[PDB]
Amino acid sequence: KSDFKFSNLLGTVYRQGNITFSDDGKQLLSPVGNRVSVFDLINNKSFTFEYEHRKNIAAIDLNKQGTLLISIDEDGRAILVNFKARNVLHHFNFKEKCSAVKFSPDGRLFALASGRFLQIWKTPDVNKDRQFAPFVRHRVHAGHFQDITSLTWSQDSRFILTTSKDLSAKIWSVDSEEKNLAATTFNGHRDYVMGAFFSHDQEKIYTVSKDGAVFVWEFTKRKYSWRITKKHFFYANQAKVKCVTFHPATRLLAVGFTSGEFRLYDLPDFTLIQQLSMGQNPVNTVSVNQTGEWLAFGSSKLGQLLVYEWQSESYILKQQGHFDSTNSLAYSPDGSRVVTASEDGKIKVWDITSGFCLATFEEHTSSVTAVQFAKRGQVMFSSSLDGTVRAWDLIRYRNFRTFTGTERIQFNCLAVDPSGEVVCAGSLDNFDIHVWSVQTGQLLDALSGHEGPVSCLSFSQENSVLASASWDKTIRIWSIFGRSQQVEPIEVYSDVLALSMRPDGKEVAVSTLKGQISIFNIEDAKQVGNIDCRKDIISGRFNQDRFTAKNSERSKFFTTIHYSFDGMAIVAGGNNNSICLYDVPNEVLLKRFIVSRNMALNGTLEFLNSKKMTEAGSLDLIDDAGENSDLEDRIDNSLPGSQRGGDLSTRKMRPEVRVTSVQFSPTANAFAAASTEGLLIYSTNDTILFDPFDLDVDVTPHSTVEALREKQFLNALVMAFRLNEEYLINKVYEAIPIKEIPLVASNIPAIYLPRILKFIGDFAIESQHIEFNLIWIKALLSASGGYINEHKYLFSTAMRSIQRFIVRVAKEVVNTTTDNKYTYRFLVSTDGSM
Amino acid sequence: YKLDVLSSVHFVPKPASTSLEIRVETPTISMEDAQPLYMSNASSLAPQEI
Amino acid sequence: GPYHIKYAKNGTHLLITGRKGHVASMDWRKGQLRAELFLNETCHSATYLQNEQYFA
Amino acid sequence: VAPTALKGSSRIIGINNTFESRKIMVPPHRMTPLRNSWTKIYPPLVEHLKLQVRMNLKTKSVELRTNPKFTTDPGALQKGADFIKAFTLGFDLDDSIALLRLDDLYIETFEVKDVKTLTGDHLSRAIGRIAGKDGKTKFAIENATRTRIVLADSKIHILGGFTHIRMARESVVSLILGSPPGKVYGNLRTVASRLKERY
Amino acid sequence: KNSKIFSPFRIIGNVSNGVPFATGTLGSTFYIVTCVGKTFQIYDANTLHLLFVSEKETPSSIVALSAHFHYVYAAYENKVGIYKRGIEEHLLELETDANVEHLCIFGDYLCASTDDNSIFIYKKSDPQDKYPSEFYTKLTVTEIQGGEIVSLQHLATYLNKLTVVTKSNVLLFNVRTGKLVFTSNEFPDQITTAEPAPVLDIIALGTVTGEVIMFNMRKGKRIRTIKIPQSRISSLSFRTDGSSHLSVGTSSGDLIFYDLDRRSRIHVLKNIHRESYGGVTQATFLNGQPIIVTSGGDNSLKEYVFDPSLSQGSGDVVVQPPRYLRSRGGHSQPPSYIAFADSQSHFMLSASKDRSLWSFSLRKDAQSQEMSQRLHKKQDGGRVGGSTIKSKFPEIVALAIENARIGEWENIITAHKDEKFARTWDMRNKRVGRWTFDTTDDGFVKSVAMSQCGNFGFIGSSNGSITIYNMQSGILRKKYKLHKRAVTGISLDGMNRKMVSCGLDGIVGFYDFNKSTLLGKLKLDAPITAMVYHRSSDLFALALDDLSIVVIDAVTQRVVRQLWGHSNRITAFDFSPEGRWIVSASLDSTIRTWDLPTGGCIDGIIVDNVATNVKFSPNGDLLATTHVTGNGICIWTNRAQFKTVSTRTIDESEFARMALNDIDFNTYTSLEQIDKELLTLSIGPRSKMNTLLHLDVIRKRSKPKEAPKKSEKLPFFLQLSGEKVREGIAHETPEENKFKVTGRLGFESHFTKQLREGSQSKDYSSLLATLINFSPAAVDLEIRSLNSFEPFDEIVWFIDALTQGLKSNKNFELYETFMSLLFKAHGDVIHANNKNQDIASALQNWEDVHKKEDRLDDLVKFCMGVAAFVTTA
Ligand SMILES: [Mg+2]
């Protein structure tokens, strides 16, 4: 039930730091703000780790073997992670700003560029158990006079090249006895040295500067010494080199410029293979696959992540995410895809498994406030502050209809009829709920009666009534359908901020500004429960506040809520650092989730460090933009009074942790919450828990197996559920012969029917036994079809899961089979000659 | 743009106006973003439109 | 920190400017503070004008 | 060397090119191009491969022998012999040098009669079809499959990577048989894309 | 004795065990090396932050510690180890069974004194070598020469002389020549300490009867005699800040200071350390500063500072008294109860028999703090009844903590020994609360519990009554009276609905907390000693008197599992956070892990000291246990969180003497195909089929909108010219005749060879295998490259191969998809030559198979018809 865990972060593909491909090249590791996300391009799956830094990530690296991941934040704090097990081995502090961390290709040593020192450490062994001090230092090198920009390992794990802001590139030897081999310093660059590299033979060293000069260093006579034999120049008019990488095997040099264009060159010939432009923002990080075929680029400003297959001039991956912009989210009815509305005005559809944007729509001029699907799922609606309501048809990606009010009113909330024929929107400026007809587009009527702005709307899926709530401290139930129109107002203690309708359509829950979730019965218009939330909410002091968090009244209410499709649970979130999941019937908090643990965000901490406070003020509030070397960093474009609706640069204040909207998954036991960092998806998929149901001494994982060996399938299957072990249920599920399925299916007790249907839904989507599952689904529905119909909402999520399997994979297979059959008949039956 | 950000985007919508767009028949996959997946396959013009 | 220091021409007064924006003007021999600004900005350098009365 | 330093098959197919010796006969039409380009043909054989080279005016052949005291790479003789043959077959000198430089380049040779027995104007018709107007068709095949082709009357020689010459040869054969030009062009577009792709 | 699930991590809560610490200076800064049993810790003198710990636990307890710059020498039994940064670099093994007692290092010489009055001298192999390793010689002091050795010391400006101090008298040994240079006069009192003075040739000697002697070695004569009647000296140290002060530590727990110049006492610090644990075991002035670091056996380390004199002139006479500066500490006696404060491995509460309750930080020792006991003033206004002399609260027997309401009001309840009420504490403020809960039946508190919401507190009395209070206001709300004997456990489920209790009478009561009704009662055979309730799974285990752990399901009120095997009482036990394991400890000196699904012991340990408490972290990553001996907490890492653990039951007989694999690892792998008749898809991503059918269209999207400019002068064969690996179909090499369109022999492609071999052998299984392995781009290339010219051999062979594939009923979507591509690329050739027999028969054989795979459509259509109907109407 209430055992949820963070699974993946959608809405963000790159924030800052360096991107790294996996050694096999089939996985891309992208730092997304405070966490590390892994995308499996080949298998179309993605996950984001649970471990969480206290600040944004600055650098990462995965060793060649693929077992250990090291990530370093902007303060130098480092977390070592066992990649296969997805667990944290050890937290390490390097007490400096670490710029780059790179594993040696052998894997034994990893080097760190911290300030002006190059630190070489010994890797902890993954097989060994955890220890107090796993890292063992090897050596610290201090030759540079200023900070190190980047470092490169030699292919034989014996030399390291470090490029610093001293206009110098310097070479070390990891072995003391070999110091005489390489103790040289390379000079002659006009600007910072961005990168230095070896050739495949290690006889040529290339150094690249920010101004755009590439030097080829060779060991030659003028008695022998390193010299610049040849010199090359990127004649970029004003762009400065921002990131450089080199692939020795293919002699490829990928350079990303601050103007947003990147160039690919061949060394030592310096023939320009290509150059493309990904935008007007700098190319922050570039990486190369091991084979050298895929180049991954990243732009921090707009959060673009691009993987380029330069061989075929193709895009494997091309995505753009959102930061501090996701204002809403809406699940597809099957739950396969999630929609988001951003302040930019762009509606983006993300696929849950892959984590990538399937489609983007940019019709809306201003911020989109809310999004909702039709009950059918083929159509989508969205409301924006530009003054319009727009209907989207997904099958053809067309704005097939657009509605607009007469009086030029901003829209903030939206609700669509179950029949997909009426659309109503509310405003913060009009006090009236406009209603339109989907088929014709005309304004049917303007519902009036509120003395305050309408904060939220929702249709009953069954009864088709409309429930509206406002800051007027009231809730009104409109029977708009029917010959006669009726309005039934219900009073509340305080302003209403959010509203959710039970799938039954018999009750409505409303969150008030007092921090109260009140559940009312629609037909009786009387209260049936109340839940306190003010104590549960976790709110943090901002760096700018002059008052404590406890006395702070900034956000102690829930601005969004939603029922579980079963109808027994409510998930709530607000302008705060908590997502609270309440159980409706007993009015208790099942669990509380911390949205973020990043101190870069403003609202994360309840108690701030006293050291930061001074006579001058909080050290965080001092603006240090002047120190930044590049002009584009120093320039301040912030408007004095802005709070929302523009770029981060406009704010001048740190982003604030908040959950714009939350929703449950129609198909799986999971929920998605849009926040500043992105869409946090919490799921119970791992299900490591042991939650036996009606267990007894006679039931045992050992005992179940004989029931199979003795061919007592029903007793084996029922005993498998009582333990509720997935691996055991799977074992019994596949060992039952097809002949006995119709016999067993009829005899399953009614209590365990919801569980098996959930299992088949979760198992069938990714399992390879399409027909065997379909035999099972046919058996169960025929045997217990009547029971399922009587209890719709107990089986709602399970039933949707089965349909998603039957439509999304099963239908696609036969759709080709029927295709080949007809293409077959035409070729043979037809006459072809001449 | 500057005024809207200054007012925290509590502005008033602009006059509605009618404009003409040209829709070119293309496979629906082309309209999508670039990754190893597509979510629809139909054409971008309905049969009536053809 | 870090702090940039500039003495007056006659050596009677001292001007220190922190990088984080702490500017102080004082008479260092007699331990008298003339002015102390806590500008929340990035100060780079400061100098005394014709006399200790004005500084930039 | 920098202080950081680390610590007989024939490429041509369809013709028998083979202290060891190799002899390659030069046809009359390649005599003059061989002459003015010999200032750039003998160096790479004698310095890189460490071979001994001559032109036999009496027999009009290029004679190549291994020096036991100087030559070191056992495959140098065959490598050098193939390089001369590519120049003999009509490929430009820089293309021929690629065989010395690269170790994964193969020459496929075949005649129109091998694919199908064509004679008279029909044989002329096929050579016209392979060539295309102003050489467009062969140029398309060359660029799409990343191959160099020399269409010497009824004899075709294709230089490039293994699978590349396999695809260039297939397109040429399809042209000889009489497949519709559009189908051949349609493939020539997509063969290029598939070859360069990683997956 | 080695667990397969757990492994030691470190010990929390120890700063010093009583062995004299050693001070070491790196540059200007100083560090302190303290002994903790079998390992040592290095603290920074400035902040008393932990820096390093010994990598491995020494086999035997450490006896002496000496530190010189980076290197630290630790002596245990007959071996002296050399450590750098907490990692051993070299081990010195003495040749005599006698255990080392004292240790001195000067220059290249390392001197070790054994208990048999034998001094071993080691020397550096090289003058520039960092530490001595080589064995130089052996010097033995006989009883005629002197008594037992008290300590070894080396005065400054002495070439190769070691000042051996014995109880009887002092001796001077020349290590280089190994000859006794000088012998002191016999002293009347037994010497107990020796400290070189900052002056030349003078070493301070402390006797057992409170005499401090400023013995001058060069003159061999006494210089001064301080007298401390009725005291025993334990440490001596000199102030090097330019003031002639001497700090004289005593075993009674006092530290006296003398000003040698003025022959007067500056001050006395009384009871800085407990006398029961050895008093001031060591007190050392930091070199050249007024800070003195003091330690003792009570598990504490303190620092005191001399402030500057408050008089402008005559600063020498007006000396400010020493002032407490900073310290670190722990329990003086083993902890009695423990609990994890927060969901993370964040903080850990510990209460000990020394009547002090501590909050220990797992992640930084500096964060550890003692929960103060200062009381609030009563709300009523009446005076609080208590002895004027302040005394710590009695020992904490039971503890319960919740965090649903941390920072709003009290969130901890504690029960005290022989006390008729339970006190409250607040974790956020780190101080005792303002509420006291009384049993109201004249009975001692035996059990305390908290509701998850953090509103209620349950107190279980020894007389059988359960009283329920409200934490916010400390007002009694309800009292339940079922048990007649002592209640030994109380718990409430997460939903705050069903409450369960247990008592010595052996009955387990089931209550409905909302309605205040008795749902049911269960009688067990034996008295119940303890209870652990798992809220996520609604299972609670009961430690019965008959050496069993009985697991019960609160929902149905029946015994679900019973665990046997402990040979004595079960001290404590806990549930794993995932609800799958129970770890229990017993007086027979073992810890056993029980796998609840199978109900058997999977791991067993034999602990030298009985484990009095066992507690899992809520994460499950760490297991913490406390023992009857040792002032600290033993922390164990859970190996199960990084790899699977076999659930095979442990061997009982072997465990006593010391004092299906898929099922064993709780995993299962789905079959490749249940039945040959059942259709089965491919073992791979499901986007493979969609990608194959629409390869070209997806690529068109992938292309950039604007063409990329390229250099006019580029190598034609750049792609081939890659120094060396790419495995693409582009990178294929031939494997070793008339020209053939499909492929010349020796030049053929691997795919064609497998096809042609398949045609002759009449089995394409090898070809189907490689086709599935092919990437989508490769598959399109091969299908199109098939020969389409008469007699159409390759096309016909390909159809038979795919016809063979469908018969298997495996990977049928990919075999199907290949035929969609075959028609797309070669549809016209098939159409034009449909009358050809080889194509017609090959196609006809295919149709007969493909017609059989039509049952799938019937199932798919049926399920949609009902699934839409059932879910709708
Ligand atoms: Mg009426």
Curated annotation (Swiss-Prot), chain A:
| Pfam hit, one | ANAPC4_WD40
CDD domains per record: WD40 (cd00200)
For this UniProt record, give its keywords in alphabetical order, as a comma-separated list. Answer: Nucleus, Phosphoprotein, Repeat, Ribonucleoprotein, Ribosome biogenesis, rRNA processing, WD repeat
Q: Give a Gene Ontology cellular component term annotated to this protein.
A: nucleolus
Output the InterPro entries linked to this UniProt entry.
Apc4-like_WD40_dom, G-protein_beta_WD-40_rep, PWP2, Quinoprotein_ADH-like_sf, SSU_processome_Utp12, WD40/YVTN_repeat-like_dom_sf, WD40_repeat_CS, WD40_repeat_dom_sf
Location in the cell reads: Nucleus, Nucleolus
Note the segments forming the WD repeats: 11-51, 52-92, 93-131, 143-182, 188-222, 236-275, 278-318, 321-360, 363-402, 406-448, 449-488, 491-530, 553-592, 654-692
> Main site of residence?
nucleus
Cited function: Required for bud-site selection and cell separation. Also involved in nucleolar processing of pre-18S ribosomal RNA.
**Which family does the similarity line name?**
Belongs to the WD repeat PWP2 family.
Other notes on this protein?
Present with 16700 molecules/cell in log phase SD medium.
Record text on subunit structure and interactions: Interacts with snoRNA U3. Interacts with MPP10. Component of the ribosomal small subunit (SSU) processome composed of at least 40 protein subunits and snoRNA U3.
For this entry, the protein name equals Periodic tryptophan protein 2
What species does this protein belong to?
Saccharomyces cerevisiae (strain ATCC 204508 / S288c) (Baker's yeast)
From Swiss-Prot, chain B:
Location in the cell: Nucleus, Nucleolus
Q: Which domain of life, per UniProt?
A: Eukaryota
Segments crossing the lipid bilayer: none
Give the family per the record: Belongs to the MPP10 family.
Q: How does it assemble?
A: Component of a heterotrimeric complex containing IMP3, IMP4 and MPP10. Interacts with snoRNA U3. Component of the ribosomal small subunit (SSU) processome composed of at least 40 protein subunits and snoRNA U3. Interacts with the SSU processome subunits EMG1, IMP3, IMP4, KRR1, NOC4/UTP19, NOP1, RPS4A, RPS4B, RPS6A, RPS6B, RPS7A, RPS7B, RPS9A, RPS9B, RPS14A, RPS14B, UTP1-UTP18, UTP20-UTP22 and UTP25.
Task of the protein: Involved in nucleolar processing of pre-18S ribosomal RNA. Required for the early cleavages at sites A0, A1 and A2 during 18S ribosomal pre-RNA processing.
What's this protein's name? U3 small nucleolar RNA-associated protein MPP10
- Which organism does this sequence originate in? Saccharomyces cerevisiae (strain ATCC 204508 / S288c) (Baker's yeast)
Of the intact sequence, the residues represented are 446 to 495 of 593
From Swiss-Prot, chain C:
Q: Where in the cell is it found?
A: Nucleus, Nucleolus
Q: Where are the WD repeats?
A: 1-38
Complex formation: Interacts with snoRNA U3. Interacts with MPP10. Component of the ribosomal small subunit (SSU) processome composed of at least 40 protein subunits and snoRNA U3.
Q: What does this protein do?
A: Involved in nucleolar processing of pre-18S ribosomal RNA.
Query: Anything further noted?
Result: Present with 5800 molecules/cell in log phase SD medium.
Instruction: Provide the protein name.
Output: U3 small nucleolar RNA-associated protein 7
**Gene transcribed to yield this protein:** UTP7
- Which span of the entire protein is present here? 112 to 167 of 554
Swiss-Prot record, chain E:
State the domain notes.
The WD repeats are grouped into two tandem seven-bladed beta-propeller regions.
Classification from the root reads: Eukaryota, Fungi, Dikarya, Ascomycota, Saccharomycotina
Which Pfam family is one of this chain's hits? Beta-prop_WDR36-Utp21_2nd
Instruction: Tell me where in or outside the cell this protein is found.
Output: Nucleus, Nucleolus
Positions of WD repeats: 22-53, 63-93, 101-140, 150-183, 190-227, 234-269, 277-329, 336-370, 397-436, 445-479, 487-523, 528-563, 565-606, 608-646
| Gene3D superfamilies per UniProt | YVTN repeat-like/Quinoprotein amine dehydrogenase
Q: What protein name applies here?
A: U3 small nucleolar RNA-associated protein 21
Note, other: Present with 2020 molecules/cell in log phase SD medium.
Q: Might you name a Gene Ontology BP term for this protein? A: rRNA processing
User: Which organism's genome codes for this protein?
Assistant: Saccharomyces cerevisiae (strain ATCC 204508 / S288c) (Baker's yeast)
Which keywords accompany this UniProt record? Acetylation, Nucleus, Phosphoprotein, Repeat, Ribonucleoprotein, Ribosome biogenesis, rRNA processing, WD repeat
Tell me the function of this protein.
Answer: Involved in nucleolar processing of pre-18S ribosomal RNA and ribosome assembly.
- Cellular component terms per the entry's GO annotation: 90S preribosome; nucleolus; nucleoplasm; nucleus; Pwp2p-containing subcomplex of 90S preribosome; small-subunit processome
List the CDD domains: WD40
Record note on quaternary structure: Interacts with snoRNA U3. Interacts with MPP10. Interacts (via WD repeats) with UTP18. Component of the ribosomal small subunit (SSU) processome composed of at least 40 protein subunits and snoRNA U3.
Main location (coarse class): nucleus
